[PDB]
Amino acid sequence: QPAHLCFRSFVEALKVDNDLVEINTPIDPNLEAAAITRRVCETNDKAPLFNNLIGMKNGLFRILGAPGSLRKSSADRYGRLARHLALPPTASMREILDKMLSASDMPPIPPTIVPTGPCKENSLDDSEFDLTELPVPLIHKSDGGKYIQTYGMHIVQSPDGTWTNWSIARAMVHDKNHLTGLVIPPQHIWQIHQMWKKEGRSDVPWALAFGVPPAAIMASSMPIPDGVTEAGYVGAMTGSSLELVKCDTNDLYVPATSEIVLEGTLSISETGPEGPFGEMHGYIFPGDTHLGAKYKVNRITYRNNAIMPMSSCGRLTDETHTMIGSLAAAEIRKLCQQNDLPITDAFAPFESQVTWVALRVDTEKLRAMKTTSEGFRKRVGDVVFNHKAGYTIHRLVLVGDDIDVYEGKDVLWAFSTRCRPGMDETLFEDVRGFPLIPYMGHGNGPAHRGGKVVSDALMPTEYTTGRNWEAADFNQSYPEDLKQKVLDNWTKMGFSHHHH
Amino acid sequence: QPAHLCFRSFVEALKVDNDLVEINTPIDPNLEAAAITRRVCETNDKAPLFNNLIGMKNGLFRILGAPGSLRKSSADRYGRLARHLALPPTASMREILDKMLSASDMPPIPPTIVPTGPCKENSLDDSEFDLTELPVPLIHKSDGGKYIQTYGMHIVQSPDGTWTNWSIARAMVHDKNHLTGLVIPPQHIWQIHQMWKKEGRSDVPWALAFGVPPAAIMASSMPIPDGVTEAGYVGAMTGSSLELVKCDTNDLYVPATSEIVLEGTLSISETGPEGPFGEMHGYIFPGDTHLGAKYKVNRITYRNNAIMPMSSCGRLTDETHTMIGSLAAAEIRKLCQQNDLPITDAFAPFESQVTWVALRVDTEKLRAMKTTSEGFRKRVGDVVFNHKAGYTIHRLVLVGDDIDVYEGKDVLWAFSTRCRPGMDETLFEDVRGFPLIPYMGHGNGPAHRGGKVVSDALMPTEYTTGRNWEAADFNQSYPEDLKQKVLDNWTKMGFSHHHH
Ligand SMILES: Cc1cc2c3c(c1C)C(C)(C)C[C@H]1C(C(=O)O)=C(c4ccccc4)[C@]4(C(=O)NC(=O)N=C4N2C[C@H](O)[C@H](O)[C@H](O)COP(=O)(O)O)N31
Ligand SMILES: Cc1cc2c3c(c1C)C(C)(C)C[C@H]1C(C(=O)O)=C(c4ccccc4)[C@]4(C(=O)NC(=O)N=C4N2C[C@H](O)[C@H](O)[C@H](O)COP(=O)(O)O)N31
Ligand SMILES: [K+]
Ligand SMILES: [K+]
Ligand SMILES: [K+]
Ligand SMILES: [K+]
Ligand SMILES: [Mn+2]
Ligand SMILES: [Mn+2]
């Protein structure tokens, strides 16, 4: 089965790419697995596969860390993400995001139901498993639980059956047969939960599938629109209908090749302690436990020699940066274009801890609008900050066509030199805020509201007559023939490979 | 003569350090020299010495580019600056800035007058030189003149004789015997010029010395206090009285080993076209000529085989970042401490195009102050933004003791995650602004006023009870014994030198 359609095949792909380290000696899921994975993420090393995990019993489970993190080389930096999508390993960020957006004006390709698959190779009923007896990792030393769920996909369906959502949201073990997790507005798992709560009749039928098709976990991490079933979006993107099998104990459908499947319910009434957790912005606040959603597990099914993917998240660079930031930026780019705003590209700079998005403006089109900074900032921020795609993003930086938004150094340069603090910015206090950012939920103001800004790093003449500067750099401040002579004589003179 | 006390010896030091490329084939001062130097600066290569400069006649002149720019290796990144100061080449930024501040509570060591020196080996009177006939560089293709002066020191004295200032300010050739240059408030060359203008009797006696003692060019680039003669500050810092010789045509005194000396006057009445220039923030605005100060040259003296230092400034990283930013930050650190503010360290991040300064706070001392963010932001910004040391800096970022301000990645992390836009910031519109930043002089508001901000990236409990988080990083989210085990087994498991 293709790497993008089967997690087991994805793992082989990373091996083939010389992008895997298999660790066959015993590794402790109590911090050691996640510490190794953390180090990998902070140094862009090869992904670790822990084949001998202390506590693994009857096939549950191995761990793969850092599934969507960065490679060291510039040429295949985003190769792990490309392997989620059938793209060449040298694919650019632009090409990855364009692939993730491609299904947005295609007909869905609904999934195909098949009678069985590898995820049914083993099963444990409610008398045979105990989640406290599995080798669930402690990922950070101050975490408030063992986070089984950092890279699986929650599956919930609207009461009326018309929308089945796939998404990543964290969850930790509560007891032998329950998890607790984050279920917060405006996320789709929350939106659907609300529907069931209003109906008031039953808990939400639920499944959590780990080690799903890589193209599916990518969509699970992207804010595609309300009401859109991720399975059909992934089908359209990949050009193939995804093969799903029915759960044993409910009527939801899971990828046939899922490594591990939990079946059960998400309560409409119960809560339990959740967190704290070492989160995407690089912090944990020890002891900050709050009540979270409570999930009951009724059944586990799993592949022979099951592998659990794990994100050891926190400071740069991991899945919470490469996927959350980048996929939100992609959706924001489309959202802006659909609102008739002249945006060509968007990216969440890693330097900003993916709290900013830089928006590249087609300034020819801007000039024809005959507008001003105040007006344009206001229009852009209203579109983005009033939409779910803008939830995680607290600063938008508008830049002209000379800036490559996928290059943080160039975004930082433009922001620092072209946006006058205060005057060239518009603050938004009456929009939903992202509480996980420390300055929100642990800050001086309302955890859930405001703290957003549009920072205009377009220069004045970009709105009127055109760019009126040249950079003081090698590229722009010397003629072509001179630059080429310098390059051609560089090593000859005594000064100092793409792939590496 | 020691490298820090003699430019010629500094050049030998760079050779010895394997940090020089000598180019003995003909190089054009029309863009080629500066393009090579630009490339060096953008790639942290070895400094170029152009020994065969097309147009050099009767000893005037060779060029050294990139004298204060960065080396490629992390271990001796700031080695060129260390060589300005007699420090080991592995000196940290903290050690360099501490050396530059050390003279601030020492008695000056006045200079020693000597009867002659290498700068008197050759001379040209007013009938023998023509500045348009020297190999003065065109540094950027759209510059409004040939910038002879990018790394020499202007020497002017107060009318009453009590203060002799040494500083770097750009100047370009106007005609056979004049320069034009930037002389702007609140700079000391401007302050002294004003004194002479008010007196109204004569033009300002002036000298411009190129290839001065490296310790002297460092102080020339630092905003040491009003009224303080740089020569005596450098004397105290180095522990040695600088040897100076009298000019031939005026009573000013120049370093004995100066490579090239211009003697003449800075007019109190005349101006001429100056600029545009490819400036520190990385831009040129072609055609933006304005009137600048006008200097008359009466005499040139110079060393045999004179070397002119040159800064090919613009985008990262050159002298305008490593020296302007860092030395301003040093002075701001002291200024804050002298105003009883609990600041331990300051640096201007290169990522900010040296328009920000990050201020590391001793949060134990902050807590004892029993204050709040609003109040503290206001106090810090009033101290810094009302002082000349804060002129070039438009954003101050307050960070707690866990942040290494000399590490831009960590400053960016703290700023992005700990400072809520708007609420955690105070804007300053009634302070002097830095017009060279594009968003000031080519922006939407007053070129000379406002556009400054204090951004508080201290978390709330840093003011009260103490830091209440741990980072989600390898360092902080795993116990010591586990971290060391991971490190010790890293290569054994299959994962991947200080000097490199
Ligand atoms: C990749 C990823 C992702 C994620 C995550 C992760 C990962 C790895 C972890 C590791 C697990 C971490 C965690 C966190 C932390 O950091 O902790 C987080 C946060 C983040 C943001 C926000 C809020 C939260 C999560 C949770 O928990 N919750 C939620 O909610 N979400 C989320 N995410 C996101 C998501 O996925 C999107 O958003 C879509 O989009 C969904 O879908 P829809 O359908 O709804 O649209 N998570
Ligand atoms: C290192 C260096 C330095 C500098 C410079 C340079 C260099 C290399 C060049 C290349 C030549 C460039 C240029 C510019 C541009 O960018 O163009 C500039 C600007 C900058 C800022 C500001 C304003 C301007 C200069 C001019 O021009 N002017 C002035 O004014 N200044 C200046 N600087 C600074 C200085 O030096 C300080 O500030 C002290 O401090 C002084 O002293 P006192 O005594 O007064 O204190 N410059
Ligand atoms: K999703
Ligand atoms: K602007
Ligand atoms: K100075
Ligand atoms: K703050
Ligand atoms: Mn969804
Ligand atoms: Mn001075």
Side-chain angles (χ1 to χ4, degrees), chain A residues 1-56 58-71 73-175 177-200 202-408 410-466 468-491 493-495 497-499, chain B residues 1-56 58-71 73-175 177-200 202-408 410-466 468-491 493-495 497-499:
Chain A
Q1 300 232 336
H4 66 297
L5 300 179
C6 176
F7 183 82
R8 188 70 66 96
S9 297
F10 170 85
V11 171
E12 290 311 287
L14 302 188
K15 182 183 178 182
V16 172
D17 283 354
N18 191 27
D19 191 36
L20 195 70
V21 166
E22 298 194 72
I23 308 184
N24 297 328
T25 61
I27 292 291
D28 201 333
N30 175 27
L31 297 172
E32 183 177 31
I36 293 165
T37 304
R38 185 90 294 262
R39 185 76 173 186
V40 162
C41 294
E42 292 179 20
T43 62
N44 300 342
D45 217 318
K46 299 176 181 184
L49 179 63
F50 304 105
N51 286 322
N52 193 350
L53 183 74
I54 293 168
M56 81 194 296
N58 303 317
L60 287 172
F61 40 70
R62 302 151 63 192
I63 288 170
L64 179 76
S69 294
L70 299 179
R71 300 183 176 175
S73 300
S74 65
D76 66 343
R77 177 67 47 71
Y78 303 116
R80 287 204 192 122
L81 302 176
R83 293 306 188 201
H84 283 71
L85 295 174
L87 296 170
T90 51
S92 66
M93 181 55 57
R94 169 73 187 199
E95 286 168 334
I96 291 160
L97 302 182
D98 283 352
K99 179 62 160 182
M100 291 301 306
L101 287 166
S102 63
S104 63
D105 67 353
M106 298 174 177
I109 300 182
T112 293
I113 298 172
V114 302
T116 193
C119 72
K120 301 295 190 176
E121 285 164 359
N122 304 270
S123 69
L124 301 161
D125 70 29
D126 53 12
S127 74
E128 298 171 311
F129 69 81
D130 178 333
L131 294 168
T132 75
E133 293 281 350
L134 296 177
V136 182
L138 187 66
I139 302 181
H140 320 83
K141 73 184 193 189
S142 296
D143 286 348
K146 299 179 180 326
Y147 275 85
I148 195 176
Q149 158 48 13
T150 60
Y151 206 75
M153 170 174 105
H154 292 282
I155 305 169
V156 293
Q157 182 177 97
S158 60
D160 71 7
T162 64
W163 172 30
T164 304
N165 197 83
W166 296 347
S167 62
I168 302 179
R170 71 188 192 209
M172 44 163 269
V173 173
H174 178 78
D175 68 11
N177 62 334
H178 300 78
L179 309 180
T180 57
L182 270 196
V183 173
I184 62 180
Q187 300 289 67
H188 289 160
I189 187 166
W190 179 92
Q191 293 186 20
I192 290 166
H193 174 90
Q194 291 286 117
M195 301 172 188
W196 291 79
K197 192 177 194 176
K198 285 174 200 167
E199 188 187 65
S202 79
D203 289 331
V204 186
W206 165 81
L208 170 57
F210 306 99
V212 298
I217 207 64
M218 287 297 279
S220 293
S221 303
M222 183 177 189
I224 74 171
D226 297 352
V228 178
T229 291
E230 280 73 9
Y233 189 97
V234 177
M237 170 171 74
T238 65
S240 74
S241 176
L242 298 178
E243 295 191 340
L244 312 182
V245 288
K246 203 182 75 69
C247 288
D248 300 332
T249 64
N250 66 43
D251 284 349
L252 297 177
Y253 286 81
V254 294
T257 65
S258 298
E259 292 285 330
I260 308 163
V261 177
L262 313 180
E263 311 184 353
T265 52
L266 165 59
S267 182
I268 61 162
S269 61
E270 304 320 300
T271 58
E274 194 281 330
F277 184 58
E279 295 166 350
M280 66 180 289
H281 303 106
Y283 300 75
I284 183 168
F285 290 78
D288 205 25
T289 305
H290 296 284
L291 296 176
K294 193 173 184 174
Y295 304 85
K296 180 174 189 269
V297 177
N298 291 325
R299 187 167 178 89
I300 308 180
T301 79
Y302 56 104
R303 291 191 65 138
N304 296 334
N305 305 294
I307 309 168
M308 171 66 83
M310 178 184 68
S311 180
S312 185
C313 56
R315 290 200 68 184
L316 292 177
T317 316
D318 62 61
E319 296 71 28
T320 70
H321 318 119
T322 68
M323 293 168 60
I324 304 177
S326 312
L327 298 172
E331 191 74 7
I332 287 166
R333 185 222 305 178
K334 179 183 47 103
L335 170 70
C336 287
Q337 292 172 350
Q338 292 182 334
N339 282 274
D340 302 313
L341 297 172
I343 302 310
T344 67
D345 290 88
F347 190 64
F350 297 132
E351 298 87 340
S352 77
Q353 204 72 18
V354 300
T355 71
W356 303 5
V357 163
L359 299 177
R360 185 175 177 263
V361 179
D362 179 331
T363 61
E364 182 178 14
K365 287 181 175 192
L366 181 69
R367 286 179 275 278
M369 292 172 68
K370 303 280 182 187
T371 195
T372 74
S373 179
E374 285 97 324
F376 190 55
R377 292 187 307 250
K378 289 207 159 151
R379 189 168 170 195
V380 171
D382 279 346
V383 165
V384 178
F385 296 149
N386 290 310
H387 193 282
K388 170 170 171 300
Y391 168 53
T392 66
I393 302 306
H394 273 250
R395 167 172 260 129
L396 293 170
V397 180
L398 312 178
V399 302
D401 310 67
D402 74 302
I403 300 298
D404 182 354
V405 295
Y406 305 107
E407 285 301 329
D410 297 333
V411 172
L412 291 169
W413 174 60
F415 174 74
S416 299
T417 60
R418 305 175 189 183
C419 175
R420 179 170 166 149
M423 179 171 292
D424 291 346
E425 307 186 298
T426 299
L427 293 161
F428 286 77
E429 295 290 7
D430 191 21
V431 295
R432 190 184 312 267
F434 186 25
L436 273 63
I437 297 173
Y439 66 64
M440 294 303 294
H442 294 96
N444 295 304
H448 301 280
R449 211 90 197 135
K452 299 207 170 191
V453 61
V454 179
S455 296
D456 193 1
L458 293 157
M459 290 287 295
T461 63
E462 304 196 87
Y463 285 87
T464 55
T465 53
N468 63 342
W469 69 90
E470 302 172 338
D473 68 358
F474 181 80
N475 185 41
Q476 298 184 38
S477 265
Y478 309 94
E480 296 296 319
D481 54 353
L482 177 59
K483 292 180 300 169
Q484 192 60 48
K485 179 194 188 190
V486 169
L487 293 185
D488 286 353
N489 289 328
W490 197 244
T491 62
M493 284 185 287
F495 299 106
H497 297 152
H498 173 62
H499 287 288
Chain B
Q1 300 232 336
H4 66 297
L5 300 179
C6 176
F7 183 82
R8 188 70 66 96
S9 297
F10 170 85
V11 171
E12 290 311 287
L14 302 188
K15 182 183 178 182
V16 172
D17 283 354
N18 191 27
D19 191 36
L20 195 70
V21 166
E22 298 194 72
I23 308 184
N24 297 328
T25 61
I27 292 291
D28 201 333
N30 175 27
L31 297 172
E32 183 177 31
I36 293 165
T37 304
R38 185 90 294 262
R39 185 76 173 186
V40 162
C41 294
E42 292 179 20
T43 62
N44 300 342
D45 217 318
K46 299 176 181 184
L49 179 63
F50 304 105
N51 286 322
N52 193 350
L53 183 74
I54 293 168
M56 81 194 296
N58 303 317
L60 287 172
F61 40 70
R62 302 151 63 192
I63 288 170
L64 179 76
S69 294
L70 299 179
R71 300 183 176 175
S73 300
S74 65
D76 66 343
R77 177 67 47 71
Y78 303 116
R80 287 204 192 122
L81 302 176
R83 293 306 188 201
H84 283 71
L85 295 174
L87 296 170
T90 51
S92 66
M93 181 55 57
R94 169 73 187 199
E95 286 168 334
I96 291 160
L97 302 182
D98 283 352
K99 179 62 160 182
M100 291 301 306
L101 287 166
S102 63
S104 63
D105 67 353
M106 298 174 177
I109 300 182
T112 293
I113 298 172
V114 302
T116 193
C119 72
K120 301 295 190 176
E121 285 164 359
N122 304 270
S123 69
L124 301 161
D125 70 29
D126 53 12
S127 74
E128 298 171 311
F129 69 81
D130 178 333
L131 294 168
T132 75
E133 293 281 350
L134 296 177
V136 182
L138 187 66
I139 302 181
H140 320 83
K141 73 184 193 189
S142 296
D143 286 348
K146 299 179 180 326
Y147 275 85
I148 195 176
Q149 158 48 13
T150 60
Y151 206 75
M153 170 174 105
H154 292 282
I155 305 169
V156 293
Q157 182 177 97
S158 60
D160 71 7
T162 64
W163 172 30
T164 304
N165 197 83
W166 296 347
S167 62
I168 302 179
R170 71 188 192 209
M172 44 163 269
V173 173
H174 178 78
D175 68 11
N177 62 334
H178 300 78
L179 309 180
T180 57
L182 270 196
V183 173
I184 62 180
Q187 300 289 67
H188 289 160
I189 187 166
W190 179 92
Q191 293 186 20
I192 290 166
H193 174 90
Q194 291 286 117
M195 301 172 188
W196 291 79
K197 192 177 194 176
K198 285 174 200 167
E199 188 187 65
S202 79
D203 289 331
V204 186
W206 165 81
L208 170 57
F210 306 99
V212 298
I217 207 64
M218 287 297 279
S220 293
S221 303
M222 183 177 189
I224 74 171
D226 297 352
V228 178
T229 291
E230 280 73 9
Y233 189 97
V234 177
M237 170 171 74
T238 65
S240 74
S241 176
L242 298 178
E243 295 191 340
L244 312 182
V245 288
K246 203 182 75 69
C247 288
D248 300 332
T249 64
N250 66 43
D251 284 349
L252 297 177
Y253 286 81
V254 294
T257 65
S258 298
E259 292 285 330
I260 308 163
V261 177
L262 313 180
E263 311 184 353
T265 52
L266 165 59
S267 182
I268 61 162
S269 61
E270 304 320 300
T271 58
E274 194 281 330
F277 184 58
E279 295 166 350
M280 66 180 289
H281 303 106
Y283 300 75
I284 183 168
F285 290 78
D288 205 25
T289 305
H290 296 284
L291 296 176
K294 193 173 184 174
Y295 304 85
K296 180 174 189 269
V297 177
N298 291 325
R299 187 167 178 89
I300 308 180
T301 79
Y302 56 104
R303 291 191 65 138
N304 296 334
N305 305 294
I307 309 168
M308 171 66 83
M310 178 184 68
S311 180
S312 185
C313 56
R315 290 200 68 184
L316 292 177
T317 316
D318 62 61
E319 296 71 28
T320 70
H321 318 119
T322 68
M323 293 168 60
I324 304 177
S326 312
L327 298 172
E331 191 74 7
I332 287 166
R333 185 222 305 178
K334 179 183 47 103
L335 170 70
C336 287
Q337 292 172 350
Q338 292 182 334
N339 282 274
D340 302 313
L341 297 172
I343 302 310
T344 67
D345 290 88
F347 190 64
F350 297 132
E351 298 87 340
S352 77
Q353 204 72 18
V354 300
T355 71
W356 303 5
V357 163
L359 299 177
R360 185 175 177 263
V361 179
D362 179 331
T363 61
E364 182 178 14
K365 287 181 175 192
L366 181 69
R367 286 179 275 278
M369 292 172 68
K370 303 280 182 187
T371 195
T372 74
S373 179
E374 285 97 324
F376 190 55
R377 292 187 307 250
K378 289 207 159 151
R379 189 168 170 195
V380 171
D382 279 346
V383 165
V384 178
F385 296 149
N386 290 310
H387 193 282
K388 170 170 171 300
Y391 168 53
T392 66
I393 302 306
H394 273 250
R395 167 172 260 129
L396 293 170
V397 180
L398 312 178
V399 302
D401 310 67
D402 74 302
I403 300 298
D404 182 354
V405 295
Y406 305 107
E407 285 301 329
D410 297 333
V411 172
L412 291 169
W413 174 60
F415 174 74
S416 299
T417 60
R418 305 175 189 183
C419 175
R420 179 170 166 149
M423 179 171 292
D424 291 346
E425 307 186 298
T426 299
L427 293 161
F428 286 77
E429 295 290 7
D430 191 21
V431 295
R432 190 184 312 267
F434 186 25
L436 273 63
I437 297 173
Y439 66 64
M440 294 303 294
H442 294 96
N444 295 304
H448 301 280
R449 211 90 197 135
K452 299 207 170 191
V453 61
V454 179
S455 296
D456 193 1
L458 293 157
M459 290 287 295
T461 63
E462 304 196 87
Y463 285 87
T464 55
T465 53
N468 63 342
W469 69 90
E470 302 172 338
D473 68 358
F474 181 80
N475 185 41
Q476 298 184 38
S477 265
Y478 309 94
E480 296 296 319
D481 54 353
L482 177 59
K483 292 180 300 169
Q484 192 60 48
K485 179 194 188 190
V486 169
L487 293 185
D488 286 353
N489 289 328
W490 197 244
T491 62
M493 284 185 287
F495 299 106
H497 297 152
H498 173 62
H499 287 288

